[PDB]
């Protein structure tokens, strides 16, 4: 089998992407944030504290003839950005882009943090990291990809995120029309439960390539590119007037600037992030200070190849017995 679904930016800055997901019978369609950095499929629901729901579409398991309470199971998750959610668990039929899994753990939120409530466009998350990170207790549950894998034509999914435009998540096949040149594959460590890999270096604008190993994760659920402070300082030094602002929480730059590109290495291959992808707009309405899309990972504890980086590429998440990652230009 295969599946193919369009993913759409939630706003004009590509702060996140939402993908429609069918849950239950008859189908209830919710717009979920596909997150290769976590492993829980959780939704706003009829069980979510009413004051914490503001415009989201909810899953109502009592209206689904295929929903079953997973008795005794609970979940609770905290994300890198400090947001969180928790609740109980149902199993139900879940379909993405024509690909159907029966018996999928659908984690129903009883509580969500303010960041989730305040974002009316995201109805929940669909985790695509390794199932070892799943938070369901006392019986850990599998991700949608893990459940689908044996049925797929090939044990892979791909992310093709757009810049200020829709893109695609495919399951079970590699669309050879969706990228230019060849896909370069690189080793993955699953030791921390992430799609963790090692970039071979970077360049700033038209500058020379610096060969240096940068360990990080491919994370579709993180907006920005988070790299070591040395690398990030070298980037922003090429933008007149750019500075790290502790009050804003990262590097900012004059909105009048033209940003240089940023290149990262994948083996001997190179992915070029255009300068425009690094512009996250005014820090507040009307300001002439703009937020940068490349930020320091210092104090995160890990480097993160988030959407800023991934949207410059066609990315293969290969879930073979020994997983790998593939990157192509597009």
Curated annotation (Swiss-Prot):
Residues of the Peptidase A1 domain: 17-328
Source organism (scientific name): Cryphonectria parasitica
Residues of the full protein shown: 90 to 419 of 419
BP terms from Gene Ontology: proteolysis
EC category name: hydrolase
E.C. designation(s): 3.4.23.22
Cysteine disulfide partners in this protein: 255-290
GO MF annotations, alphabetized: aspartic-type endopeptidase activity
Coiled coil: none
Residue numbers annotated as active site: 35, 199
Protein keywords: Aspartyl protease, Disulfide bond, Hydrolase, Protease, Signal, Zymogen
Family membership noted in the UniProt record: Belongs to the peptidase A1 family.
Keyword Protein biosynthesis belongs to the record: no
Catalysed transformations (reactions): Hydrolysis of proteins with specificity similar to that of pepsin A, prefers hydrophobic residues at P1 and P1', but does not cleave 14-Ala-|-Leu-15 in the B chain of insulin or Z-Glu-Tyr. Clots milk
Protein name listed in UniProt: Endothiapepsin
Record carries keyword Signal: yes
């Amino acid at each position: 089998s295969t599946g193919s679904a369009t993913t759409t930016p939630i706003d004009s800055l590509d702060d996140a992407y939402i993908t429609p997901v069918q849950i239950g019978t008859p189908a209830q369609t919710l717009n979920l944030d596909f997150d290769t950095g976590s492993s829980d499929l959780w939704v706003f629901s009829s069980e979510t504290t009413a004051s914490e729901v503001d415009g989201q579409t909810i899953y109502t398991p009592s209206k689904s003839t295929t929903a079953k309470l997973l008795s005794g199971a609970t979940w609770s998750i905290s994300y890198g950005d400090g947001s969180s959610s928790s609740g109980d668990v149902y199993t139900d039929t879940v379909s993405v882009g024509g690909l159907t899994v029966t018996g999928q753990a659908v984690e129903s939120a009883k509580k969500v943090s303010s960041s989730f409530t305040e974002d009316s466009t995201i109805d929940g998350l669909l985790g695509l990291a390794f199932s070892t990170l799943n938070t369901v207790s006392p019986t850990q549950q599998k991700t949608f990809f893990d459940n689908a894998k044996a049925s797929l034509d090939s044990p892979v999914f791909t992310a093709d995120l757009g810049y200020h435009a829709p893109g695609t998540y495919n399951f079970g096949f590699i669309d050879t029309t969706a990228y230019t040149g060849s896909i370069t594959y690189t080793a993955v460590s699953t030791k921390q439960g992430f799609w963790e890999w090692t970039s071979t270096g970077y360049a700033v604008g038209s500058g020379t390539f610096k060969s240096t190993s940068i360990d990080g994760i491919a994370d579709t659920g993180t907006t920005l590119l988070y790299l070591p402070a040395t690398v990030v300082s070298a980037y922003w030094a090429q933008v007149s007037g750019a500075k790290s602002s502790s009050s804003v929480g990262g590097y900012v730059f004059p909105c009048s600037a033209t940003l240089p590109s940023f290149t990262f290495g994948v083996g001997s291959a190179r992915i070029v992030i255009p300068g425009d992808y690094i512009d996250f707009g005014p820090i507040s309405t009307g300001s002439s200070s703009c937020f940068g899309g490349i930020q320091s990972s210092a104090g995160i504890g890990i480097n993160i190849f988030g959407d800023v980086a991934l949207k410059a590429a066609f990315v293969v998440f290969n879930g073979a017995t020994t997983p790998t990652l593939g990157f192509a230009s597009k």
